[PDB]
Design a protein around this ligand. Structure first.
Ligand SMILES: Nc1ncnc2c1ncn2[C@@H]1O[C@H](COP(=O)(O)OP(=O)(O)O)[C@@H](O)[C@H]1O
Ligand SMILES: Nc1ncnc2c1ncn2[C@@H]1O[C@H](COP(=O)(O)OP(=O)(O)O)[C@@H](O)[C@H]1O
Ligand SMILES: Nc1ncnc2c1ncn2[C@@H]1O[C@H](COP(=O)(O)OP(=O)(O)O)[C@@H](O)[C@H]1O
Ligand SMILES: [Mg+2]
Ligand SMILES: [Mg+2]
Ligand SMILES: [Mg+2]
Lengths: 162, 371, 371, 371, 162
């Protein structure tokens, strides 16, 4: 449905923050991961116009720029059944990011935001956008468990070593 | 009622009202994300600094520019800087005043189409207009003819223009500019060991460049002065306190404008693409272009740049007739000031791009407004 | 309702409620078993004294510390001291009030993982939080920037931090601290014959150290004053009654902070690992770190320590710009007081580690809470 | 008659004769003073050990490196190590054989000027020549084109070069290298409690690093293997006898080459500054640079480093065309072996720097010999 | 005469040995104190060339590197009157180290070599180099007496204490 549309390569490398940045306690990882997905889905100008402004027109009510619009976006994410026409337009974007040409480089960085920044600390209770965008990049959706484990205690030998 | 004029500078966003002599606020076009822990609880907010507050806080930020080579790349950040212009530093409602964006010639169409689409459908300005850089600079001259060496932070370009009429085929444009100066100055500080690596140091390289670097009148004979290095070196205090000094690297950096093979780009220098532009122009105008050369843009604030190109174009011109280099003392703001004039003309209020004619036109309306 | 803050001191456990100015109870972190016959029949009970009652009864005990070098070693005794904090001296139910443990940076992970596992699965506190030592001390400063010479009893460390944002790669840490002072003071009392051998005497060495030892402004020139030994010596009454006196050993002991080769560890002194930390920091912050150096921790209560490092960092800094040493008169309690502030902030009650989120997380939850 | 080639390694001095396949003697670039009493009367001589004898005797020495970041700092010690090369281990008269020093690109000029002045006016060699590191490594390839990821102990750098002709503006260089790996490995051993502090332990950290650390193919998915920590851990016997073990810290240390934010330096990884170098090169060469990537230097002996960057540059390149990573099994000695070839060419004996042309030239002669 | 010349700060901190090292009986404190002064007077590369190689050229016949050259250097120090042209060039270096920017940090460490290593055990009979270099750093030259005293015997009280 959005055929004839493409993106420029490596469009998001300036946007992904440092690892010491995302180890912050005042780091609301939602609006900076979406801000990566916003920049990563910036359509290349080689796409023709009538498919460009439609796909951009789908974006502004899905991935807004202002911090009050995305905070307003989460408001209907609690009752996504009662908002079908925006909920139905979301899986279109999920279909687009499924065929994204740098999907693996996204999917490598997408769950790098999940562990180091704690993006997926709800694990099944995250809202509708962070659910399917990760499910757009991670096919099996196996991100539910796995970042929580960190191999806490094991001492196969001697005590403190000096 | 009044109009705003806001030169989208590639390095420094210059902005202000129409009819004002000086631009109201000039701030560097830098957006910056922080890059560290933030173990404080209160000061961890404001996750993207932009402008002067990113300039002062530059030690903990990854300073990135939204515009490179005159082409607006990161449109998400470019909203953030324009929101900082209107609300945060001009304190004006954008929905009430008309704006006037400015841009380089020969940039991509989508740099213009997106720029108007992000102006109406985001800021809801009443009317806008996009101007070529150098054709604003003749309004700053108060003179209707002559080519313009408009060298900015991101791109340099020549727009030859006779009285009224421009020469669109003879517009030449080189991407060598102040960032290519700054990046080459970073390369040659390493020869003296002053290894400046990342973007915070890339900022203070420009403070070295704008305070120290002059361009030489005769490059080889003044290089030979640096052989007997007696009085060439000055010395610059870094923000930490330790001091540097710099010798032949002080003038060898702005010779990139004249020998672009120093950064290895295969081109003619800006003295020669001047003459290559005037040879492209028709034969009657060439007498008047030689008498009318407007230096413009902040890169051309190097001391000695007027005395050099007046010498060097004379080497290329036929020597029987005179050359002039019109270098005013306001070259840094010349694109804005000419932009401040053009919005104030009474014959211009029909030349805008209004919203009521935008809505049936779409973003291609700016291609039928001065190309 | 209220929170408890209990700095796990390497030498002195400091504890109290949130929002209180002074910590409620400060007692030395000493557990001690007796080591003799006990031929009395009634007083033979209480086979492990801890805290002040081990301090007064120190003549018949083997006084051992549970924490060495900031690393909690004996976890069996470390339960015994925390049980003494909550029940025996604060008289509060730990299951009702949230706690806030504090620890040094760059300690092992199991020092943190076991510490939370022994906090929930033993004391059943509602919510806990682990803080880096020195980042609490800026809250005691009421100022959001500057490195901290936080020298405790067990470890010293520098946490450089700009406004909000810390520098995790530039955190430096040396194990030289007050016990390494005390052990070196025991070595140099033997030069005057005052052989203090075992742990009861190791306690009274610290009473010699905290009452007498000052650090010299200029080490060699004030050593030469001890050559003409006229007014340097003071004299200290031991608990038995016989008196000692001490000359050049009074100031030569705290020079271990500046010449770590005295105890033979190959390192830079705390004046130099200060400067080595600030050189690791980025170049813009260095102007502000030099104006903001917070002495903290009980080791830095030596008289003259501020006048020394202000002189000595000035020897290492570029002399064109100023240095400051922020040494408040509450440096002994600065980690607690800043800890008392941080728990009292209204923006902090979402930053805890609750039990209801612990149970599906396990002890690795503190690694995703401020590292 | 024959020439010597002696790669001034930042970590390991590699040396030998011209035309030899293997370098004659490889010893670590360590000079070391002792740091203790020496109450023996006979063995107190030889107050500065250097090389392998400093390596074996490393427990009583302060091991210091003369070269950091590819820049020769301590010129007094750098004489001592070169005197150890020629006399003590090669047993050759330096006045008879020509030498060939090697160095990194973009190092300071005084690192080159002093290096030739300390070669003639101290060792009196007949003729010398200074070579860029990576341009020697193509001679080891036997192939005349392709960029080189030459990552040494002290610096990594990319020298893109087409057949014959190099790209001087596209030479990129990062200071992240094996010491920055070793220093970060020392930081992350403390998370498991293995506190290795001083320079003798900094040596044995490198023995941990070179024997154990591999780089991961996919960092996050193989980090998740360390969550179910079953088969990742190996275990290493220290020289005293007590054994360590190491889990996720084994592969997390060489990820500093790819995420330089781990040591907090703001840069692109060596996978990305590869691609940033090739984007700087002109558009025809880019097809051939992608087919020709030479890993070189001892840092790139990590297992899996070829399988990683072949994956990761493929993520950055346009996927329509192939990538190759030429990782020979002699990458540790590739700079020497290509240096051994270049001195043996019959077309090279006019390319030296002779003493008879030095004497009227002075130390600036090497700046007019291959920059 | 050597104007326009400067040094880098903290250039000698790696060179100064540990205190337990300089409490050695096989520690000939001359050639390791000169080796500190050699490194501490290493001219910074920001100095221009024709003042650099002259001041370096004065050094190699004053502060050599080899242990046989400094041992040869002491040979004319016994008859320094009969070698005027090197004796006259020494006070030039004494003038240079007088205006050294880290003079106090040198002069603090310079007499730290005097006591702990026993550098000045001749006290008036030391040779010409160690004389004026210390006199270059110590202005009044009061290093003759003072390191010898150590406050041997004083008992203002009781006997052995157990
Ligand atoms: N007074 C000055 N002296 C030397 N260089 C200057 C001076 N002012 C500005 N520059 C250089 O010119 C550049 C500013 O370019 P500018 O004209 O602002 O670009 P733009 O036209 O895109 O806004 C900066 O990189 C700066 O280094
Ligand atoms: N007033 C003082 N004068 C000198 N030394 C002191 C003083 N107070 C404490 N100390 C030393 O400081 C140490 C206490 O440090 P402390 O603040 O307990 O560190 P921590 O709280 O991290 O354990 C003790 O070993 C003591 O020797
Ligand atoms: N087999 C190996 N495995 C892993 N790392 C190695 C190996 N061999 C060497 N290294 C690393 O490479 C460094 C040697 O690099 P070197 O050849 O000295 O570079 P340069 O000669 O340019 O200084 C050592 O410090 C070590 O850390
Ligand atoms: Mg400008
Ligand atoms: Mg404590
Ligand atoms: Mg190498």
């Amino acid at each position: 449905p959005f055929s004839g549309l493409k993106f420029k390569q490596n469009s998001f490398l300036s946007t992904v923050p440092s690892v010491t940045n995302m180890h912050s306690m005042h780091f609301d990882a939602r609006e900076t991961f979406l801000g990566v997905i916003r920049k990563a889905l910036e359509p290349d100008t080689s796409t023709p116009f009538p498919v460009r402004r439609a796909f951009d027109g789908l974006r502004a009510e899905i991935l807004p720029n202002d911090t009050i619009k995305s905070a307003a976006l989460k408001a209907q994410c609690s009752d996504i059944d009662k908002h079908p026409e925006l909920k139905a337009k979301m899986e279109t974007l999920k279909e687009v990011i499924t065929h994204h040409p740098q999907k693996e480089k996204l999917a490598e960085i997408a769950l790098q935001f999940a562990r180091e920044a704690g993006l997926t600390r709800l694990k099944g209770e995250t809202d509708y956008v962070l659910s399917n965008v990760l499910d757009g990049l991670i096919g099996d959706g196996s991100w539910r468990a796995g970042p929580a484990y960190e191999s806490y205690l094991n001492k196969p030998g001697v005590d403190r070593v000096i | 009622t009044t109009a705003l004029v806001c030169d989208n500078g590639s390095g420094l966003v210059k902005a202000g009202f129409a009819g004002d002599d000086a631009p109201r606020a000039v701030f560097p076009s830098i957006v910056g994300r922080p890059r560290h822990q933030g173990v404080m609880v209160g000061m961890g907010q404001k996750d993207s600094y932009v402008g002067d507050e990113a300039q002062s806080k530059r030690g903990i930020l990854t300073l990135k520019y939204p515009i490179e080579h005159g082409i607006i790349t990161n449109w998400d950040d470019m909203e953030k800087i324009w929101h900082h212009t209107f609300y945060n530093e001009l304190r004006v409602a954008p929905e009430e005043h008309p704006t006037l964006l400015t841009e380089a010639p020969l940039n991509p169409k989508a740099n213009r189409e997106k720029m108007t689409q992000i102006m109406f459908e985001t800021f809801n300005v009443p009317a806008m207009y996009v101007a070529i850089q150098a054709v604003l600079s003749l309004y700053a001259s108060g003179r209707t003819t002559g080519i313009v060496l408009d060298s900015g932070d991101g791109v340099t370009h020549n727009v030859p223009i006779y009285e009224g009429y421009a020469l669109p085929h003879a517009i030449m444009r080189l991407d060598l500019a102040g960032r290519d100066l700054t990046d080459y100055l970073m390369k040659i500080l390493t020869e003296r060991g002053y290894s400046f690596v990342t973007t915070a140091e890339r900022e203070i390289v420009r403070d070295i460049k704008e305070k120290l670097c002059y361009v030489a009148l005769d490059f080889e004979n003044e290089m030979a002065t640096a052989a007997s290095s007696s009085s060439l070196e000055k010395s610059y205090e870094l923000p930490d306190g330790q001091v540097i000094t710099i010798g032949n690297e002080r003038f060898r950096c702005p010779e990139t404008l004249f020998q672009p093979s120093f950064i290895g780009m295969e081109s003619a220098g800006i003295h020669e693409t001047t003459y290559n532009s005037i040879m492209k122009c028709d034969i009657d105008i060439r007498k008047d272009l030689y008498a009318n050369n407007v230096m413009s843009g902040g890169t051309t604030m190097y001391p000695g740049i007027a005395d050099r190109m007046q010498k060097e174009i004379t080497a290329l011109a036929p020597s029987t007739m005179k050359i002039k280099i019109i270098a005013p003392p306001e070259r840094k703001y010349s694109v804005w000031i000419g932009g401040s004039i053009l919005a104030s003309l009474s014959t211009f209020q029909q030349m805008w791009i209004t919203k009521q004619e935008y809505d049936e036109a779409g973003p291609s309306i700016v291609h039928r407004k001065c190309f």
